[PDB]
C-alpha cells in the first residue's frame, strides 16, 4: 500500500485551514 508521506509542519497549516495520525486527525475532524 502506497502513502504520500507528508511532512510535519504541513499538517498544522492544513489543520488551521480546517479551523495514531489517523487517530489524532480524527478528533480534529470532529471539530
Amino acid at each position: 500500500d502506497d502513502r504520500v508521506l507528508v511532512t510535519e509542519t504541513q499538517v498544522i497549516r492544513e489543520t488551521l485551514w480546517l479551523l495514531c495520525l489517523r487517530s489524532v486527525l480524527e478528533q480534529i475532524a470532529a471539530y
Partner: protein, 58 residues
Amino acid sequence: CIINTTITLAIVVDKLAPRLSQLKVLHKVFSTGVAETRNVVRASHLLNTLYKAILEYD
C-alpha cells in the same frame, strides 16, 4: 509564528483549549436551531433555547 520557535502537534492543540471548549457548546446550541416550518415557530423555538441554555450555565 510558523513562518517566522519550535511548534508541533501537541502544542497547538493545548494552546487552543479555551477555543475547542467554547466551540463544543455551539454544536449543542445550534443543534436545536437546525432540527426545526412556519416562520413564527422557527424563530420562537430558537430564541427560547438560548434563554434556557443560559440558565443551565449559571
